[PDB]
From Swiss-Prot, chain A:
Species lineage: Eukaryota, Fungi, Dikarya, Ascomycota, Saccharomycotina
Subcellular localization(s) per the UniProt record: Nucleus, Nucleolus
Gene: MPP10
Family, per entry: Belongs to the MPP10 family.
Subunit structure: Component of a heterotrimeric complex containing IMP3, IMP4 and MPP10. Interacts with snoRNA U3. Component of the ribosomal small subunit (SSU) processome composed of at least 40 protein subunits and snoRNA U3. Interacts with the SSU processome subunits EMG1, IMP3, IMP4, KRR1, NOC4/UTP19, NOP1, RPS4A, RPS4B, RPS6A, RPS6B, RPS7A, RPS7B, RPS9A, RPS9B, RPS14A, RPS14B, UTP1-UTP18, UTP20-UTP22 and UTP25.
Protein's name in the database: U3 small nucleolar RNA-associated protein MPP10
Function description: Involved in nucleolar processing of pre-18S ribosomal RNA. Required for the early cleavages at sites A0, A1 and A2 during 18S ribosomal pre-RNA processing.
From Swiss-Prot, chain B:
Positions annotated as WD repeat: 22-53, 63-93, 101-140, 150-183, 190-227, 234-269, 277-329, 336-370, 397-436, 445-479, 487-523, 528-563, 565-606, 608-646
UniProt xrefs under InterPro entries: Quinoprotein_ADH-like_sf, SSU_processome_Utp21, WD40/YVTN_repeat-like_dom_sf, WD40_repeat_CS, WD40_repeat_dom_sf, WD40_rpt
Entries under SUPFAM superfamilies matching the protein: Quinoprotein alcohol dehydrogenase-like, WD40 repeat-like
Cellular localisation: Nucleus, Nucleolus
Organism, as annotated: Saccharomyces cerevisiae (strain ATCC 204508 / S288c)
Domain comment (free text): The WD repeats are grouped into two tandem seven-bladed beta-propeller regions.
PROSITE patterns, alphabetized: WD_REPEATS_1, WD_REPEATS_2, WD_REPEATS_REGION
Function: Involved in nucleolar processing of pre-18S ribosomal RNA and ribosome assembly.
Taxonomy of the source species: Eukaryota, Fungi, Dikarya, Ascomycota, Saccharomycotina
Quaternary organization: Interacts with snoRNA U3. Interacts with MPP10. Interacts (via WD repeats) with UTP18. Component of the ribosomal small subunit (SSU) processome composed of at least 40 protein subunits and snoRNA U3.
GO cellular component: 90S preribosome; nucleolus; nucleoplasm; nucleus; Pwp2p-containing subcomplex of 90S preribosome; small-subunit processome
Identification of the protein by name: U3 small nucleolar RNA-associated protein 21
Curated annotation (Swiss-Prot), chain C:
Subunit relationships: Interacts with snoRNA U3. Interacts with MPP10. Component of the ribosomal small subunit (SSU) processome composed of at least 40 protein subunits and snoRNA U3.
Family of the protein in this entry: Belongs to the WD repeat PWP2 family.
Protein name per its UniProtKB record: Periodic tryptophan protein 2
Residue numbers spanned by region Disordered: 631-652
UniProt WD repeat ranges: 11-51, 52-92, 93-131, 143-182, 188-222, 236-275, 278-318, 321-360, 363-402, 406-448, 449-488, 491-530, 553-592, 654-692
Cystine bridges: none
Keyword Protein biosynthesis among record annotations: no
GO biological process: endonucleolytic cleavage in 5'-ETS of tricistronic rRNA transcript (SSU-rRNA, 5.8S rRNA, LSU-rRNA); endonucleolytic cleavage in ITS1 to separate SSU-rRNA from 5.8S rRNA and LSU-rRNA from tricistronic rRNA transcript (SSU-rRNA, 5.8S rRNA, LSU-rRNA); endonucleolytic cleavage to generate mature 5'-end of SSU-rRNA from (SSU-rRNA, 5.8S rRNA, LSU-rRNA); establishment of cell polarity; maturation of SSU-rRNA; maturation of SSU-rRNA from tricistronic rRNA transcript (SSU-rRNA, 5.8S rRNA, LSU-rRNA); ribosomal small subunit assembly; septum digestion after cytokinesis
GO MF, one example: mRNA binding
Keywords: Nucleus, Phosphoprotein, Repeat, Ribonucleoprotein, Ribosome biogenesis, rRNA processing, WD repeat
Other comment: Present with 16700 molecules/cell in log phase SD medium.
Annotated function: Required for bud-site selection and cell separation. Also involved in nucleolar processing of pre-18S ribosomal RNA.
Curated annotation (Swiss-Prot), chain D:
Covered residues, full protein: 112 to 277 of 554
Role summary: Involved in nucleolar processing of pre-18S ribosomal RNA.
WD repeat start and end residues: 1-38, 119-158
Protein name as it appears in the record: U3 small nucleolar RNA-associated protein 7
Subcellular location: Nucleus, Nucleolus
Quaternary context: Interacts with snoRNA U3. Interacts with MPP10. Component of the ribosomal small subunit (SSU) processome composed of at least 40 protein subunits and snoRNA U3.
RNA sequence: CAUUGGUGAGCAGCGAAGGAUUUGGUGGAUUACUAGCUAAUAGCAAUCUAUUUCAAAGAAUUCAAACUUGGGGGAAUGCCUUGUUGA
């Protein structure tokens, strides 16, 4: 972090790496921020994934 | 005389009208009170910064001003007002028709002298009262006693004596007893000024023939006599800084300084103020300081300072001459032209008959400055031709300003009286520019205009030729020759494509500035006197000779509106920033506001003095006008900026004697429902449907990720124990028997009463009204709380209520939402007992209505299919 | 046309000061830097006032009537504002650092905490006309020995409690006759008294101190005097009280600590109701609704705003904004929503009407440089300096794919195929353009030919060519699709900084380092126009600069440009204080907009006050952190040379006014500009301007109404358009019966067709007449469907607005209708038993 | 401004330190300026060392020793946020106290931290030396005055002389 | 032959009781104008201080208090912590 800030963020990106992420089925509204509106009401997992 | 759109705000550019100013001290600091027509202003002596102005204008012009600590006394007609911080605290009304002339305040006694040689004395009701209010007595000086009163003075260390100074001689009255203590010996010359000296028992008297007398009141004899032959004393003042100096101001505009100890003249300041406006009307040394404040009738207030001597010894002999320290000023004669310098209402440019161009600030007076007339050295290298004696440029008839290239090169053009060229100025430097634009046809300049880009300047000559110069290099580029008489107006649109001109021959020329072609020519009935072009709307108005304003559209070159009603020449007019109003001033002393959309006069004013100029602020908040009398600029506030104005035409006959509501206020409110057969949504936020359907999921998102920590020992009824308001469904009280599940009579909810009432009355209109008003949480709670047990009366009634609502075709989106919540909460109940006749019949009737509202789907599908096809292929 | 006005500020919900609820409780007033933003939570609408302080706002208040708003900056400069008219009544300079201002509950008086003095003034009448000195002083009180931290009014407007840094709280009487009733000083606090309040009965006075002690004061026998009957302590380990508020009716005490956690207490019992944490940053301000149900907290460091419904333990509002971070913006294809990319690495989707962030994405590790939608709009793409390009699916908010170069290149610019099948990114260190396949995620190829870093990219919507520019002083048009690969380089006089593609796809404009906007014909590859912009640009002198703004060449160019969808205008911005709107065909400046008037920003002023300059240098450049009382404020974490990419504490230099991105609204005559303070949105919505079209003497508002009375609806409608008055068009529009709509629609002149379609799109979105508006659209499309097709780019924004109404509101209604129909059939038809 | 002033022990030289960081050393009787620093920083107090030749300034975070002409000689990294400065003339010790609640004695002759004492009473509100015995008196926010010597880790005496900060 | 190299001698043209270049000092602006001091619901502004004191209130086991240190290795004697011995 310090070296990046010092170099004004002109660094060279770190080598690409792969990781595994777990996605839990949930209503799409829950993922959004908290206010009196929602963007999408679909589910977070596609029919193939179910 | 009262406008419904505009109200006076203040007067800009005025510092003093010539009435002697008053100096008051608050602690160590000093302040000066100056008179401005029917109002006064207070300046800080250290900075000459405006502090206060009188809250309201007096009925008559102020004749005298005296200030003591916080309180200021202003005399006008037969009344003396007492002001603190510019706000009137008490008004003293004298009982005689004679007007007040002079005003003196010492101790608790207020002395006012009227023009009939009557002196009124007022006294404080209480010794600790701030100002005198009670009327004590009246002393009148008769012709045998003395001449006309010249001034009222009080000498220090005199108990209850008022030193009345008359043209003939001086008189000493005892105000407490009202008796003449002493009469001075008659003086040969008329006394004009009096000033108490810093020495005891001595008052300095100035005569009409340049004599200053140090009269000793105790001894009743002359002590000294200074002679100033062929001069008239107007002011006197002593220096209190330990140097025995005396300053004598004269009506010729000169201020002489004498050294009383040495019997010598220190210096003379020549022509500090104009003789034609009264010379030096007031000159006062600041108490205990080397600073002297001077004023005159030329609308100027100056300060001079005596520097310390340059000699290490004999400093009293080697006296540095007084040095100018600071000053404030304005025009000496009424402004001839005004304009707004910037998009904001910060600065204004004003030109006057006194041959000076000023930049006045609305935001702060100290920022006001005079634009310099120092000339730039010629680029060629030849000597510029002019008289060695420097004189100001002639009066400015027209002015044009742009800000697209401010700071890059010249951005102002001005036309002068009886001059065959136009001068340029620079707003950033505040100095005359280096270019001069000539008509090149031996004619005087009558019109000046600038392009919005700031690259071109257009000059209209009295011989009918329009020359076009470049502002950066001052090189003539193009010359148009269509008019044969004087060109009284030139304008170019924002796009710099179409140019318009007007002249005294009555024709309006339309040119293509890009291609230099004549697009068309329009002839009007009468000669055209002025033009104003509105760049946003491409409309321009022409003040014709027949007392009309003709509005023309440049795009189509046709007259769109014509305005009638002025009874004399139209001096000036302007467009409102939104392009919707025209305010015009005429020589018949009326300012009329015209509404272009309807083309009628909506407002009218009657001004005491004819308004020569009218200008809107580009913001639209202020209207500036200048009048034939007065050195300032009148600023008005646009009340249309804080409330709507009716556009009903003003009464013409009524206005002469002094000398559909939605359409009137330019608004329209949409109907609740255009037609009964038409589906109409609810009048409210469109998110209400989505919130009601998805209330739970929205709320689970709302909950914090971690449970708040709470005290174990917590009141169980804390929410109810609230000292008293909350209007939630929870905070409902019953309104006034066998047990009933839904609610026992006397203990049932408001909603259940209306539902039962509607079922009997066969009308749920009352219930539907309260459903729409219910908050989303309340609505879900009521539907969930409906009775779900046999005979299922409440569910049947609720379905009947919703079915009636769908018949109305109003608020249908909500009735659909309520039905969806009914299925969500009681769908299993309906499914289990679907065969029940009561539920089935209610459901069937709902379906019959609901089946009709499918036409909305057909419309929605068609529009997308075509809209997608139209936009794509 | 070019009549744009500042409408609202997105991207920031709170910067500093105190947030106030409206008296009704239905609106929240939040200071956002130099301006005040008002959010209506129930109606889901927001607006930002146009007026502007010269420094950041410090204290605000709205009177109980809701008619007058007073806002004060950090110098004491105050502005009185008519809340209903949204206009400024007066400007007042109190010549000191006013910590708090509060209207009396009557509304007649308001009090000021200016240093060690309490100033009581008389409220100007809102109905009265503006005058030179509207305010009238009532009294000045000088009893405190140090600065007043806060003040509180009694419910009856008769007493004022003031708390100062003197470790003391003091009470004053508004009426001189009642001075003996309340002339007491409350001592005994170890630290600054943060707040002092009355009980509902007004017989108990509570005082709170920074150290974390609450004292209960009562008038009791030891003959009677105020005494501390009880003392309560917040046993916060090291957190200090930062703000306090009390609601007498509900006896609720909300205290915000410097650790970032707030507690709700019930007085006088001192029962802990709840304890939550909004983060690690101090809670700077706390406010209570009038009913006592909603509590609003704000944290200045991250610009968080939080409304908490403590009863149900729910969040009405929970938002966080950006300052000095927004690198890019993108409109949704329907124009409803706007997306932003920030140096934090977070992508946020903001609702234009509401003013709140709908969603946040935090996958990127480093600064996100660009964002762009596909032509469809469902999908979004973003590039970042961490070396990745990520695709986002807005239906499910998943990062369904991530593209990365083989050799670890930072990406600064991005472009997406209109078919949404190819994605291209450029860099400032590689000189090549990477191309990926969206379906596969594989790197298709690396376009080469530039001799300098690629500054910008753009696909054309129709012909589908790729236009790239570089600091190589050249522009290259790539025909990537097709059997043959062709490149057409065009030379330019100077380095190209920005590039915009015409909606037609036939021309491309580029902003150069010389301050020029040059337009080229893609097919012929020849210049067709040029606009000179160096003189238009306003660049200010920085406090640290040793050279004038005129001679400064720091930013006399535009780093971002965008076209209008009609194709006739360009909006440009850069690292300067001006947003310039040009007209392409005539090559003229339509209008220029000043980005900021905040002296807290560095590039605002062209000339700096010579009083600040001294023999040492500018007084502004002197660092006064050591004066600050808290250790956190004094600490200096600045890296010696950093310019961007870190938190504000790292820079050590003042923020500089700049615009990072600009775009036109696809569905309205508005544009949005990402700047340091936030997303400025300029719109023409107000339309107070009188802009008639083709008037004659016979056309008048009265004649229009007469035509309706005579049932000449077509003539009435056309005459309304010629006047171009919205109220008249609306009046005529709703007076046309349904039977005669198709007759009128077929006969409307082609000249006024774009105007009616624009009116419907704006009117329909918020109107209740869903069926009436759909009938009109059906008649207009059916009658003039062919004409709209022949001129796609003249009708583009009007058409997009109509589709938004048909899809965002009309569909949602029928969708709720149709499921009820199926839910109905299942319940009746199926068998429910057992 | 504001300006904190310190005179030399013999009264011949005057040291003024402005809060915004204007520090000047002068012979006020002869009107001669020995040094003038325009440190763009927050300066709290300054003091002369054994004579007018050297003086110390307590800046934003560190104390600096300067020369007669104003050349910086040392940056006292060990003294952090000192708000009060004192010099014991016969012992050649420089004494500092500030927001850290730490009393530090520094030998100017050798340049070695003689002792650092933990006051345990928060920021130091006031400080004064007893010229008779060179015992330092510190006032604290709790209203107590404590007497200190470099050779004792705990205060010699504690006096309760106020109900608030001293 | 060219100097857009320097230094000079002179014209044409410009041209009203002279013209050009440089420079010290002060004043007004450089943010949007509600006045000075104090012990401040009022006094003072020529100050009182010969009523300026009393009374009342006011003291957290927080009895906690370096969020403040360039890296590696140690620290005899110090300092901190823990235990322990004898009073």
């Amino acid at each position: 972090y310090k070296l990046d800030v010092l170099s004004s963020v002109h660094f060279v990106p770190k080598p690409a790496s792969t990781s595994l992420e777990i996605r839990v089925e949930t209503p799409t509204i829950s993922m959004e921020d908290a206010q009196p509106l929602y963007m999408s009401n679909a589910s977070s997992l596609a029919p193939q994934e179910i | 005389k009262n406008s419904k759109i505009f109200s006076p705000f203040r007067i800009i550019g005025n510092v003093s009208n010539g009435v002697p100013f008053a100096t008051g001290t608050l602690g160590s600091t000093f302040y000066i009170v100056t008179c401005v027509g029917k109002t006064f202003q207070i300046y800080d002596a250290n900075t000459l910064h405006l502090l206060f102005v009188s809250e309201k204008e007096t009925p008559s012009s102020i004749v005298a001003l005296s200030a003591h600590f916080h309180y200021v006394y202003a005399a006008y007609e037969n009344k003396v007002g007492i002001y603190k911080r510019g706000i009137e605290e008490h008004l003293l009304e004298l009982e005689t028709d004679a007007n007040v002339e002079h005003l003196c305040i010492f101790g608790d006694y207020l002395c006012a002298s009227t023009d009939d040689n009557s002196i009124f004395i007022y006294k404080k009701s209480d010794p600790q009262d701030k100002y005198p209010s009670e009327f004590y007595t009246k002393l009148t000086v008769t012709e045998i006693q003395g001449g006309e009163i010249v001034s009222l003075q009080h000498l220090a260390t005199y108990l209850n004596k008022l030193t009345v100074v008359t043209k003939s001689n001086v008189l000493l009255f005892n105000v407490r007893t009202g008796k003449l203590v002493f009469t001075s010996n008659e003086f040969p010359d008329q006394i004009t000024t009096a000033e108490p000296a810093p020495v005891l028992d001595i008052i300095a008297l100035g005569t009409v023939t340049g004599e200053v007398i140090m009269f000793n009141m105790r001894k009743g004899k002359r002590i000294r006599t200074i002679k100033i032959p062929q001069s008239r004393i107007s002011s006197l003042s002593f220096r209190t800084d330990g140097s025995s100096h005396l300053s004598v101001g004269t009506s010729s505009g000169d201020l002489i300084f004498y050294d009383l100890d040495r019997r010598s003249r220190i210096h003379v300041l020549k022509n500090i103020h104009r003789e034609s406006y009264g010379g030096v009307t007031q000159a006062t040394f600041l108490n205990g300081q080397p600073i002297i404040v001077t004023s005159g009738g030329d609308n100027s207030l100056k300060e001079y300072v005596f520097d310390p001597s340059l000699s290490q010894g004999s400093g009293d002999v080697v006296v540095q001459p007084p040095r100018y320290l600071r000053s404030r000023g304005g025009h000496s004669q009424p402004p001839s032209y005004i304009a707004f310098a910037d998009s904001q209402s910060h600065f204004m440019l004003s030109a006057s008959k006194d041959r000076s161009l000023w930049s006045f600030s609305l935001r702060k007076d100290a920022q006001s400055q005079e634009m310099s007339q120092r000339l730039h050295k010629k680029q060629d290298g030849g000597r510029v031709g002019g008289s060695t004696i420097k004189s100001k440029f002639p009066e400015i008839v027209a002015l044009a300003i742009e800000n697209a290239r401010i700071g890059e090169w010249e951005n102002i053009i001005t036309a002068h009286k009886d001059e065959k060229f136009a001068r340029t100025w620079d707003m950033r430097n505040k100095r005359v520019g280096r270019w001069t634009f000539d008509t090149t046809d031996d004619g005087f300049v009558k019109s000046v205009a600038m392009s919005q880009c700031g690259n071109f300047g257009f000059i209209g000559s009295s011989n009918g030729s329009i020359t076009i110069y470049n502002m950066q290099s001052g090189i003539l580029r193009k010359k148009y020759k269509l008019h044969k008489r004087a060109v009284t107006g030139i304008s170019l649109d924002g796009m710099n494509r179409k140019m318009v001109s007007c002249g005294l021959d009555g024709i309006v020329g339309f040119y293509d500035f890009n291609k230099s072609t004549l697009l068309g020519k329009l002839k009007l009935d009468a000669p055209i006197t002025a033009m104003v072009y509105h760049r946003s709307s491409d409309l321009f108005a022409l003040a014709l000779d027949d007392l009309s304003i003709v509005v023309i559209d440049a795009v189509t070159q046709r007259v769109v509106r014509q305005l009638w009603g002025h009874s004399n020449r139209i001096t000036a007019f302007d467009f409102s920033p939104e392009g919707r109003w025209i305010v015009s001033a005429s020589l018949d002393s009326t300012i009329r506001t015209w509404d272009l959309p309807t083309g009628g006069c909506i407002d009218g004013i009657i001004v005491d003095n004819v308004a020569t100029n009218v200008k809107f602020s580009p913001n639209g908040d202020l209207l500036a006008t200048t009048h034939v009398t007065g050195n300032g600029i009148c600023i008005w506030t646009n009340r249309a900026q804080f409330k709507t104005v009716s556009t009903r035409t003003i009464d013409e006959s009524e206005f002469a004697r002094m000398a559909l509501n939605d359409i009137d206020f330019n608004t329209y409110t949409s109907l609740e429902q255009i037609d009964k057969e038409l589906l109409t949504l609810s009048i409210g936020p469109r998110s209400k449907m989505n919130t009601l359907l998805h209330l739970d999921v929205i709320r689970k998102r709302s909950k914090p990720k971690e449970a708040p920590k709470k005290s174990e020992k917590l009141p169980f009824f804390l929410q109810l124990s609230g000292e008293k308001v909350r209007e939630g469904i929870a905070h409902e009280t019953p309104e006034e028997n066998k047990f009933k599940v839904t609610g026992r009579l006397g203990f049932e909810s408001h909603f259940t009463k209306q539902l039962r009432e509607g079922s009997q009355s066969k009308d749920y209109s009352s219930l539907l009204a309260t459903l729409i008003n219910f908050s989303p949480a309340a609505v879900d709670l009521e539907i969930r709380s409906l009775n779900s047990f046999e005979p299922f009366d409440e569910i049947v009634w609720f379905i009947d209520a919703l079915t009636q609502g769908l018949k109305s075709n109003k608020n249908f989106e909500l009735y659909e939402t309520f039905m969806s919540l009914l299925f969500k909460a009681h769908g299993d109940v309906i499914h289990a007992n679907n065969k029940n006749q009561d539920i089935a019949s209610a459901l069937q009737n709902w379906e019959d209505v609901h089946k009709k509202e499918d036409r909305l789907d057909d419309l929605v599908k068609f529009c997308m299919g075509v809209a997608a096809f139209v936009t794509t292929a | 046309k070019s009549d744009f006005k500042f409408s609202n500020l997105l991207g920031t919900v709170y910067r500093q000061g105190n947030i106030t609820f409206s008296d009704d409780g239905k609106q929240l007033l939040s200071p956002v830097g130099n301006r005040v933003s008002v959010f209506d939570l129930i109606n889901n609408k927001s607006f930002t006032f146009e007026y502007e302080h010269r420094k950041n706002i410090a204290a605000i208040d709205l009177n109980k009537q809701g008619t007058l708003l007073i806002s004060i900056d950090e110098d004491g400069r105050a502005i009185l504002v008519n809340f209903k008219a949204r206009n400024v009544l007066h400007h007042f300079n109190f010549k000191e650092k006013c910590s708090a201002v509060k209207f009396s509950p009557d509304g007649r008086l308001f009090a000021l905490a200016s240093g060690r003095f309490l100033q009581i003034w008389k409220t100007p009448d809102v109905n009265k006309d503006r005058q030179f000195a509207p305010f009238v002083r009532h009294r000045v009180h000088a009893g405190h020995f140090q600065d007043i931290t806060s003040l509180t009014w009694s419910q009856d407007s008769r007493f004022i409690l003031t708390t100062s840094k003197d470790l003391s709280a003091k009470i004053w009487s508004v009426d001189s006759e009642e001075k003996n009733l309340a002339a007491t000083t409350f001592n005994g606090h170890r630290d600054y008294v943060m707040g002092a309040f009355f009980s509902h009965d007004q017989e108990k006075i509570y005082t709170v101190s920074k150290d974390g002690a609450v004292f209960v004061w009562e008038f009791t026998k030891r003959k009677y005097s105020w005494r501390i009957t009880k003392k309560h302590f917040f046993y916060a380990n090291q957190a200090k009280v930062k703000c306090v508020t009390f609601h007498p009716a509900t006896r609720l005490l909300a205290v915000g600590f410097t650790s970032g956690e707030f507690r709700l207490y019930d007085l006088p019992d001192f029962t802990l109701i709840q304890q939550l944490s909004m983060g690690q940053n101090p809670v700077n301000t706390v406010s209570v609704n009038q009913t006592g149900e909603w509590l609003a907290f704000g944290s200045s460091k991250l610009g968080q705003l939080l409304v908490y419904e403590w009863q149900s333990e729910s969040y009405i509002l929970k938002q966080q904004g950006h300052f000095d971070s927004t690198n890019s913006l993108a409109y949704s294809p329907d124009g409803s929503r706007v997306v932003t990319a920030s140096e934090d690495g977070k992508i946020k989707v903001w609702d234009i009407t509401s003013g709140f962030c709908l969603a946040t994405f935090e996958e990127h590790t480093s600064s996100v440089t660009a964002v762009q939608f596909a032509k469809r709009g469902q999908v979004m793409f973003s590039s970042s300096l961490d070396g990745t390009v990520r695709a986002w699916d807005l239906i499910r908010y998943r990062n369904f794919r991530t593209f990365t170069g083989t050799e670890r290149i930072q990406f600064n610019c991005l472009a997406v195929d209109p078919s949404g099948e190819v994605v291209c990114a450029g860099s400032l260190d590689n000189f090549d353009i990477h191309v990926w396949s969206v379906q596969t995620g594989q790197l298709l190829d690396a376009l080469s030919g530039h001799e300098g870093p690629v500054s910008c990219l753009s696909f054309s919507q129709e012909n589908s060519v790729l236009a790239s520019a570089s600091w190589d002083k050249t522009i290259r048009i790539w025909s990537i699709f097709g059997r043959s690969q062709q490149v057409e380089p065009i030379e330019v006089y100077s380095d190209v900084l920005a590039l915009s593609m015409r909606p037609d796809g036939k021309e491309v404009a580029v902003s150069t380092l010389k301050g020029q906007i040059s337009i080229f014909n893609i097919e012929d590859a020849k210049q067709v126009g040029n606009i000179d912009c160096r003189k238009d640009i306003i660049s200010g002198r920085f406090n640290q600069d040793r050279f004038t703004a005129k001679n400064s060449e720091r930013s006399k160019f535009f780093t971002t440009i965008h076209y209008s969808f009609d194709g006739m205008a360009i909006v440009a911005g850069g690292n300067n204080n001006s947003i310039c709107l040009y007209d392409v065909p005539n090559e003229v400046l339509l209008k220029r907009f000043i980005v900021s008037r905040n002296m807290a920003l560095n590039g605002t002023l062209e000339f700096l006050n010579s009083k600040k300059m001294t023999e040492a240098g500018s007084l502004d450049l002197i660092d006064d952190a050591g004066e600050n009382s808290d250790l956190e404020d004094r600490i200096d974490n600045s890296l010696p040379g950093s310019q961007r990419g870190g938190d504000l504490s790292t820079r050590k230099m003042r923020p500089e006014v700049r615009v990072t991105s600009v775009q036109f609204s696809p569905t309205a005559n508005a544009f949005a500009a990402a700047s340091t303070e936030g997303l400025l949105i300029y719109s023409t919505n107000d339309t107070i301007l009188f802009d008639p079209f083709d008037l004659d003497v016979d056309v008048t508002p009265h004649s229009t109404v007469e035509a309706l009375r005579e049932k000449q609806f077509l003539n009435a409608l056309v005459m309304a358009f010629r006047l171009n008055e919205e109220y008249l068009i609306n009046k005529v529009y709703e007076a046309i019966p349904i039977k005669e709509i198709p007759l009128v629609a077929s006969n409307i002149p082609a000249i006024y067709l774009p105007r009616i379609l624009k009116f419907i799109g704006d009117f329909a979105i918020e109107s209740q007449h869903i069926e009436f508006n759909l009938i009109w659209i059906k008649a207009l499309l059916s009658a003039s469907g062919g004409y709209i097709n022949e001129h796609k780019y003249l009708f583009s924004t009007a058409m997009r607005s109509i589709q938004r109404f048909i899809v965002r509101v009309a569909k949602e209604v029928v969708n709720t209708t149709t499921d009820n129909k199926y839910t109905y059939r299942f319940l009746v038809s199926t068998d429910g038993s057992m | 401004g504001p300006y904190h002033i310190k005179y030399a022990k013999n009264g011949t030289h005057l040291l003024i330190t402005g809060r915004k960081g204007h520090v000047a050393s002068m012979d006020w009787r002869k009107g001669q300026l020995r040094a003038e620093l325009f440190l763009n920083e927050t300066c709290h107090s300054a003091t002369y060392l054994q004579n007018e030749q050297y003086f110390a300034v307590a800046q934003k975070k560190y104390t600096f020793i300067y020369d007669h002409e104003g050349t910086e000689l040392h940056r006292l990294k060990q003294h952090i946020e000192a708000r009060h400065l004192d010099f014991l003339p016969y012992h050649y010790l420089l004494v500092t106290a500030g927001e850290t609640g730490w009393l530090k004695y520094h030998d100017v002759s050798t340049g070695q931290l003689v002792s650092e004492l933990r006051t345990k009473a928060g920021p130091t509100m006031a400080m004064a030396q007893n010229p008779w015995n060179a015992v330092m008196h510190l006032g604290h926010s709790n209203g107590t005055v404590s007497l200190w010597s470099p050779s004792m880790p705990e205060p010699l005496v504690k006096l309760l002389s106020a109900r608030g900060p001293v």
